[PDB]
Amino acid sequence: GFVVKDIHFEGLQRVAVGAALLSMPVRTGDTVNDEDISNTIRALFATGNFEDVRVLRDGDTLLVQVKERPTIASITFSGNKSVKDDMLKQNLEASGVRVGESLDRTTIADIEKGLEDFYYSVGKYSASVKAVVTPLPRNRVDLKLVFQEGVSAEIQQINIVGNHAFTTDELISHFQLRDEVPWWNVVGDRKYQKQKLAGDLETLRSYYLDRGYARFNIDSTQVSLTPDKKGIYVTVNITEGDQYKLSGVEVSGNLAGHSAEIEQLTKIEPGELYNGTKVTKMEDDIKKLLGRYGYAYPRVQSMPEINDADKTVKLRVNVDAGNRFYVRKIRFEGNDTSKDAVLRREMRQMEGAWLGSDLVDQGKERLNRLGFFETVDTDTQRVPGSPDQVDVVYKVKERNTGSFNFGIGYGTESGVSFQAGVQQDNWLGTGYAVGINGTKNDYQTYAELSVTNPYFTVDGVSLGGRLFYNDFQADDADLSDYTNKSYGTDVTLGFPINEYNSLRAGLGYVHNSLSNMQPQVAMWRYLYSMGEHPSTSDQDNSFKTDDFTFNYGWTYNKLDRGYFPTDGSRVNLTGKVTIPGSDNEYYKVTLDTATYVPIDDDHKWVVLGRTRWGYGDGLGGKEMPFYENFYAGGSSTVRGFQSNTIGPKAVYFPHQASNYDPDYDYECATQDGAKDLCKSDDAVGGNAMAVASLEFITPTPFISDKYANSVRTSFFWDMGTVWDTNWDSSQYSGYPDWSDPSNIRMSAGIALQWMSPLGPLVFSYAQPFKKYDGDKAEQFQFNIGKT
């Protein structure tokens, strides 16, 4: 053995004599063998202060000796062309490499090699990162990190080997990764770089499995660099199963006596081909049912029994309801700004109830789909001293929610659109949405300020207020010259009814300041309906209106896909009516209807049916304000026609404006010979419109199969009609019948749309084969993502 008296120290600098003592197991007065000393040495390393410790016997004393790790005084960079100094230094601190701490010398190469992977993630394999560690007079060190970032390496081929039923291209078609992306016919068609290939093989598996190739396998996926490490090859070798028809489903496992309800959940009409996604539904439908009856983590697995004789598959589905658990608490770590209710209210797993593997996860998708948090991570911890109690933790990192946004688009009906404004999604972490948006068309200057509560009611009923301003100029909207300087307020409840359905109901006020009204029969028929008798012969006039509305709305969306819908209908219906106490007295009803009906299994041949309906009228023998009129024509309605060109037209009076008639064309001006009334091809639209199109979506047949599905050709037959329902056909006997809708304006044509860098694109070329008297054509039209 050996007995200690004192404990002396050599090489203590930053570490106080106290800090050394508190880590040493062997104390003054103890009796110590050469084994306890190893465990004391062993412990002083475990503190992380020291580079090298040795504990020795000096007669009756125990002598501890240390060389402390050097202290970082500087961290400089020099090379970091793709990564900001502040972003790297923030990551170093994270990993315990911070100025004022010591240097883990055996980790220098670790630090080096630990940053390359960062550069390999983005695809800059040709990279580097050595470190210079400059010693400094008093056991300090300057850490310099010399970066030599490379050329980013691009993916020069994606090959498939073994594909016999489907051209290698058609398959690559549906991948996130591309071996070629176009420009100057540019298609916003993903990048040309490489990472996390896992998941693009999952889409390959599905594409085969979903077409009855049950025995389909991916043999090997090798990945190549070029020696220069600037090109990247990818090969997936596959084995195409023969096509197999489904026979039936044997269910076998810890069913929890629920075979009653599963024996028909695994009932499949015999003859239909194997379908890998209908399997994964079935499997989840079971996990949904076992979750329904308490079980937290129901496992299900399906190994198809293959029979090459008749070529069929008997699907063998193993079940295991497993255990049940109980959620003691649902905790939220991260919410340093957002309120606890703001995340908790987005939960689908109830606390003080039985754990759902789904409802915990569903709770997470519902949490990042808010966009309030950068990262959301779950964590189901079993509560200490309990078999079946758990705590579900959601770790959030909060995102900066406020953002300025600015966008310019270019259409025909619009011209140059300038969307712009500031938005705030999560006001002071309350869920409140405040935003000051404004848009500038050729005809409209609009700008609103919003405040919205997305949960007025705990069940997701939104109560938002809008406060808006709109200066509208009709002779820029290809309409009879008017000017409307409107502004008001609107409070609106939004009811979530159903996964697919929602309702809107609101009370609004509106100020309509009318001015610069060049006379016109239909416009004036409205004006002495309000008890206004202004002048038939000049442009100097005014009409102020103070209205209060009740607005309502229903929206039913079941489109298979947001972007290029292939299946199911959308329907919006937005109407309103004037609450007594208003200067006007009318109601308005507009209904839009789009339907997709695919004819081929691959869904490349969709049939689209669109229908837009409008109707309003006055209640107190008055008429509907002409600014509330319905129009038809342009891209958004009936193509081949000019914007708003469909419907009634102007029947003008003789007059003159303070224009000072120089050398421009005018309509029904005194200067050029004012008889009485002048018919025109100047559109006014009406109070009764009905358009309806039938568009046949097809493949795009001269573009590379690799990305052919990126652009959507279609052929359409468009028809429409507007009419004035209070048009005195009698009194104006000479003038055309604008109470008769019988005149249907039809047109046929071809459409393209894809995504350019300039934004989403949409081209239309239509010949209005059946147009009526004064309809301005416009055969080619387009938009570049007005937004």
């Binding site: 406020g402 953002s403 946004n405 966008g407 310019i408 300039l758 934004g759 570049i784």
Partner: peptide, 13 residues
């Protein structure tokens, strides 16, 4: 993505 700029991560209040 579009012509213009969507400058996210700007302000809280």
């Amino acid at each position: 993505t579009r012509v213009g700029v969507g400058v996210m991560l700007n302000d809280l209040f």
